[PDB]
Design a protein around this ligand. Structure first.
Ligand SMILES: Nc1ccc(-c2ccc(CO)o2)cc1
Ligand SMILES: Nc1ccc(-c2ccc(CO)o2)cc1
Lengths: 169, 169
């Protein structure tokens, strides 16, 4: 009991763009939005998420740690102190710890991108929320309903357990 | 009529790693292998592909254009002249053309990756074929069978039509 449709950017035969479909998914949220994202600088999508939170939807956002300052820089340019919105929680996730041949320890990246709404619908794929995915790159997503959604819910909870409050905050 | 399994790196409750499952998929190929990838420098996966082509399997590889010289350099360091293997065709795909802030003309990237074997099984997800995905990053893939695989076959053909002979050749 899993159904999957495919969408592309630039768009193919389907009516809506990927960005338009993300806005739709967010406006349709009744209870909860769970987002995992590597880089988030798109202001239009950010505005939709803030608007959802003001109507009482709980919003949980997991961002790649090494790219977090891109998001912070965007929210401050918009005049938003996101750390004051009680209905939104933002946390960061690191990759694996590894030691370089010059001995300096480093961590890698969380390479994972999905949007999970009301524990019932997922958008999963290669589209990141930044201007280069509108204008420059070719990407694709899946829209997923049914039994597979439960696996994305489990994986969200697992990343949430691992995540940390961002050090700026 | 689509079945989907998830695998993670580092691995969870599955017996094989993502890299071991990619090797398995290529060894099991009887007729055709179709690969779309952004960066390919993993020697062990390259060796499995060459071995499949010597068995008579037809191999089509589509690489992101900007990153192509990293692949060619790996093949040359292995002492292989990949140009001379007739059962493998390697071609490049570019993203969209666009103008920058200063008016200059650039192209973006093909942000897509998947492995399609015998028109019947797909591995789709965020794992790229390089050392950093083994040691540094967190990633995930889907193993897909059934009706959705036909959609990946159509998309491979569409990307193949767009693709170019690499300028380095
Ligand atoms: N001629 C042409 C134009 C665009 C694409 C396209 C959009 C998204 C993706 C990634 O699968 O490919 C393929 C071929
Ligand atoms: N504690 C812990 C360890 C590893 C992961 C992991 C690997 C790949 C992905 C992407 O979904 O997540 C999550 C939590």
């Amino acid at each position: 009991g899993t159904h999957i449709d495919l969408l592309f950017h630039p768009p193919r035969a389907h009516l809506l763009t990927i960005k338009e479909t993300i806005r739709k998914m967010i406006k349709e949220a009744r209870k909860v939005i769970a987002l995992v994202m590597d880089i988030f600088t798109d202001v239009d999508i950010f505005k939709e998420i803030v608007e959802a939170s003001t109507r009482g939807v709980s919003v949980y956002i997991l961002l790649d740690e090494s790219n977090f300052n891109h998001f912070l820089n965007m929210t401050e340019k918009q005049g938003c102190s996101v750390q004051r919105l009680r209905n939104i929680r933002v946390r960061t996730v690191k990759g694996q710890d590894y030691l370089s041949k010059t001995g300096a320890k480093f961590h890698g990246k969380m390479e994972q991108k999905f949007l999970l709404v009301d524990c019932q619908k997922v958008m999963y794929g290669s589209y990141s929320y930044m201007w280069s995915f509108e204008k420059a790159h070719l990407s694709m997503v899946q829209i997923i309903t049914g039994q597979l959604v439960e696996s994305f819910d489990e994986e969200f909870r697992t990343l949430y357990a691992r995540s940390c409050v961002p050090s700026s905050f």
